């Protein structure tokens, strides 16, 4: 039967699903690790023991335990991001969409969700792989991984809560796809990993990590890179936060053994309820439990790995959205609200700058404020709001990514860079937020092809182009069709540094993406904060 | 007789001179101090002892001893600035142009020449006062003062070479005008002092100095202010340079008495020949012997006098030229030449930055380089040349002056600000130098009214407007005619900060003159260099 597949872990039975007046197969909720519960909470994941009988893979699995956004109850803009299934620590599952009839050996794409390493679900409506699987004839896989303290509590040295176990969950699933995707018609020698925000930084981390590089062929990173300032912490800071977590739950703190045992006795929600209290600063765009630079998963510092070429050499395709900072300002900077235009006063601007660059001394804050202030019109509320947006996006996403691409391109085998700047016509968030991070995802997964979702015709066309760029890059390592007549997305090179805009207008090619601001964030400010 | 005037120092006899098909009186070379020669070299000036008989005031006096620019032998662009009379330490004289018939009590304007405190002459063709005296019916006075070591060698504590004696020479002449200008038809209760570059910083210094403020009514400052970085040094640096001067002449250095005696035995040119060897850094726009912050002429630091309102409160009119830095780059930065367009390479840019901001550590040089570099087009030779021009002009003239006007306006009685950006059609310097500092002077003294000089008609008109703005401001404290129909030069205010452009086009009013760059030079960089 077409819905029955025999894998090395056992038999699995999918389900037929409709998609754009046709059908394909879906194998939802396939287990790839033993449930990380009880004594295994915080531990490295173990492989799933093979099973007898047929695994029913017809419904979505539980989503991992996470903080849930209740900031706007009933607003779809925020709720489309929340877990849409029961939460549970038994959550390590993957989903596969397979063209019908079953391919024999086609290109595979594995999606890694974002969510700041503290949240995220593989089952969100915007992550539904049937449109891309069907339109580009690829086998689409979405995986899951532990988030929050469950995925990233780190007490370096202890083997019970070593840290990075959330990254090892992603890795185990990549191992399972390597070992079994052939039975679903996928070609294991052609898998592309891709993801957004923390999913994009994760992708960059498997490119760096020696233990992960052999499990995939190519990579796509959307608004995230491994060197982002919010994506990793030192073993010492990881340790400090784990102890503070324990102190918030009245744990015995005399040894790692004692702390870990107390944390393992707590219900999931007791951990989620105090998670945010461990941040070292009053900050924006900073998350509590994130990957740790441990000497194992990452052999040395990220920057020294980048400089020395210590990473997988292959082709990459990556980019960012125009307004990366707005979500974070809305939720945590003063003067911003969902239902107003959020014109910012000079006081609120300064407050925002301090929140955006937590680790900066006063000279540093003055350097940032001067770089983004138009002194001929310093009380322009819209300019202050947009300047803050840019400060957050450049410091947290764009410049870190630009630094990664320039370092990578030096040893890589081909880089394609984009700047996504089309705001969706049906976005429910206010206009002032612009092209919000994550809102390029619906176009990558092809939602504009379904009429009832209400996109425009040009939006459906943009979706088809991005899907085909992503799937052609995955199959061949180049997003362009060989002899097509369409205009070409040029390769990004150390010298010319070209990139393309991605929107409903005719492709325009540019050079040196936000160079002015990125020389400030990647060269000057680090130098200013180190000397001073 | 109209050419004979009896002053308190004695009788003086002028000469009738033609001017634009008419005539006026000129009293050239009137002595206002005893010759500062021999033992009086470096000493404060003494009043000129009254004389019997008639002082022949029909020819220009000697110019003070100074370094002479031989960088372009025979080129008029540089030679029109060189001494045009025999040099001599007997040089303290003043010149007066008086309307005919002799006024009874008219507005007086006293010109103080620039020249970096190391050079300058009151007798230059561009400083000829007959055109302004005649056209605006004012009594025009030009004074002289010791420059170089002769005017500014400073060994604070010793009464033989105290420093600032060049400033006291200007002051003595202002005293003589206060006491005698009435006999020439001038009104001593209405004298305006005005000057350019070091002459403009001098004017600002008499506004600050308690011993000078009662000798004049109003002030005009052209491309210079007292707080400029090249206009003063501490008593300790003054001292260091005086000792180094002595060491370059093999002087006995055991006491001030010994050093001073050796320096007094040297011929003038032995001093001028080694003058430049005492600079502490490889620099541009820095001069050896300049005013010293001594606790007498300046009671406390300039910035604390400015902050506390410790200065003469009156009306001021001041401004700058568009391309203040070009002269200094031409003469001392690498890659610039008189007969080429001077496109600058990135190496030469960086060399120039280091020369322009001598006192800066590496982080500081990086801060300047980032602020003036267009990172999307960093090898643009013209952009590098123009950026260097701006760096020199903003740091040395424009921003210091902008800081002075904002501090002054808070306690003053009226400020008028201009931005002169018309390049003269007959300029012999190359195009790349732009509106060169000092080339607004010919328009202030009215040279475009004499046909044989070859200016355009619109240039003659601009000259007439500037002459009338300067002379009306001098007479009334406002450059505008009461009920004229001409557009108005608005007052500069703490809040609106308005200024006007000054050129051959219809007057345009603007606000916050080079604010972006000046917040960098007046607020951020000083803060960066103090912390680091
Ligand atoms: C990616 O790698 C391939 C092969 O490793 C590069 O192609 C080789 O290019 C060199 C120099 O141009 C030739 O000597 C070889 O004959 C090529 N080999 C093959 C199989 O084509 C290719 O240039 C690389 N691409 C990038 C963008 O670096
Ligand atoms: C310059 O000073 C004069 C007088 O010191 C100012 O005029 C006075 O203004 C105050 C308040 O407007 C009035 O009470 C007086 O009657 C005015 N006196 C005279 C003689 O007019 C004038 O405003 C000042 N100008 C500036 C630009 O500060
Ligand atoms: C497993 O899938 C769902 C479970 O909710 C349901 O159709 C049925 O219980 C199972 N299907 C089969 C074929 O066992
Ligand atoms: C003084 O002026 C010049 C000196 O060069 C000359 O005309 C003459 O010697 C003198 N004139 C008078 C009237 O004494």
Question: What do you see in this structure?
Answer:
- The structure is a homodimer of 532-residue chains.
- Chain A has 16 helices and 16 strands.
- Chain A has 532 residues and is α/β, with parallel strands linked by helices.
- Chain A has a single domain, classed as 3-Layer(aba) Sandwich (Rossmann fold).
- Chain A is globular.
- The first copy, chain A, starts with a strand and ends with a helix.
- The A-B interface holds A 363, 366-367, 370, 374-376, 511-512, 515-516, 519-520, 523-524, 527-528, 531-532 and B 363, 366-367, 370, 374-376, 511-512, 515-516, 519-520, 523-524, 527-528, 531-532.
- A molecule of 2 linked components (NAG-NAG) binds next to loops of chain B.
- Chains A, B: It holds the Pfam family COesterase.
Chain-wise SSE layout:
Two copies of one chain form a homodimer.
Chain A: E1 4-7, E2 10-13, E3 15-18, E4 23-31, E5 54-56, H1 76-79, E6 93-98, E7 106-112, H2 130-136, E8 139-142, H3 148-152, H4 165-180, E9 186-196, H5 198-208, E10 218-222, E11 233-234, H6 235-248, H7 256-265, H8 268-274, E12 292-293, H9 302-308, E13 316-321, H10 326-332, H11 346-356, H12 362-371, H13 381-409, E14 415-420, H14 441-444, H15 457-476, E15 498-502, E16 509-511, H16 515-531
Parallel strand pairs in A: 2-5, 7-8, 7-9, 9-10, 10-13, 11-12, 13-14, 14-15
Antiparallel strand pairs in A: 1-2, 3-4, 4-6, 6-8, 15-16
Helix pairs in contact in A: 11-13, 12-16, 13-16
One 2-acetamido-2-deoxy-beta-D-glucopyranose (NAG) is lined by residues 56, 58-59 of chain A.
């Amino acid at each position: 039967s077409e819905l029955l597949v025999n894998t090395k872990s056992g038999k699995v039975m999918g389900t037929r699903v409709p998609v754009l007046s046709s059908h394909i197969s879906a194998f939802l909720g396939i287990p790839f690790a033993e449930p990380p519960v009880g004594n295994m909470r915080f531990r490295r994941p173990e492989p799933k023991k093979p099973w007898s009988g047929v695994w029913n893979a017809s419904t979505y699995p539980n989503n991992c335990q996470q903080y849930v956004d209740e900031q706007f109850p009933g607003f779809s803009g925020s709720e489309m991001w929340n877990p849409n299934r029961e939460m549970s620590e038994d959550c390590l599952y993957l989903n596969i969409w397979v063209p019908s009839p079953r391919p024999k050996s086609t290109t595979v794409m594995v999606w890694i969700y974002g969510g700041g390493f503290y949240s995220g679900s593989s089952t969100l409506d915007v992550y539904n792989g049937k449109y891309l699987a069907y339109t580009e004839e690829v086998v689409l896989v979405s995986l899951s991984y532990r988030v929050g303290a469950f995925g990233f509590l780190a007490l370096h040295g202890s083997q019970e809560a070593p840290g990075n176990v959330g990254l090892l969950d992603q890795r185990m699933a990549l191992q399972w796809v390597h070992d079994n995707i052939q039975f679903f018609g996928g070609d294991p020698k052609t898998v592309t990993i891709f993801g957004e925000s923390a999913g994009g930084a994760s992708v960059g981390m498997h490119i760096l990590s020696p233990g992960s590089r052999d499990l995939f062929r190519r990579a796509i990173l959307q608004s995230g890179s491994p060197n982002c300032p919010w994506a990793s912490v030192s073993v010492a800071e990881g340790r400090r936060r784990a102890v503070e977590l324990g102190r918030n739950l009245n744990c015995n703190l005399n040894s790692d053994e004692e702390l870990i045992h107390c944390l393992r006795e707590k219900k999931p929600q007791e951990l989620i309820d105090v998670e945010w209290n461990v941040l070292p600063f009053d900050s924006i765009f900073r998350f509590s439990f994130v990957p740790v630079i441990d000497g194992e998963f990452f052999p040395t510092s990220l920057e020294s790995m980048l400089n020395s070429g210590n990473f997988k050499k292959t082709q990459i395709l990556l980019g960012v959205n125009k307004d990366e900072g707005s979500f974070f300002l809305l939720y945590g900077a003063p003067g911003f609200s969902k239902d107003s235009e959020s014109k910012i006063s000079r006081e609120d601007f300064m407050s925002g700058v301090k929140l955006s660059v937590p680790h900066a001394n006063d000279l540093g804050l003055d350097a940032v404020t001067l770089q983004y202030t138009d002194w001929m019109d310093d009380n322009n509320g819209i300019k202050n709001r947009d300047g803050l947006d840019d400060i957050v996006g450049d410091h947290n996403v764009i410049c870190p990514l630009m630094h990664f691409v320039n370092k990578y391109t030096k040893f890589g085998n081909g880089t394609y860079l984009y700047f996504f700047n089309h705001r969706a016509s049906n976005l429910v968030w206010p206009e002032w937020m612009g092209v919000i991070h994550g809102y390029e995802i619906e176009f990558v997964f092809g939602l504009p092809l379904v009429k009832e979702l209400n996109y425009t015709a040009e939006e459906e066309a943009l979706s088809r182009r991005i899907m085909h760029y992503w799937a052609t890059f995955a199959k061949t390592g180049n997003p362009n069709e060989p002899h097509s007549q369409e205009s070409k997305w040029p390769l990004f090179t150390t010298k010319e540094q070209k990139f393309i805009d991605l929107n409903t207008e005719p492709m325009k090619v540019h050079q040196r993406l936000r160079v002015q601001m990125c020389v400030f964030w990647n060269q000057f400010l680090p130098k200013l904060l180190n000397a001073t």
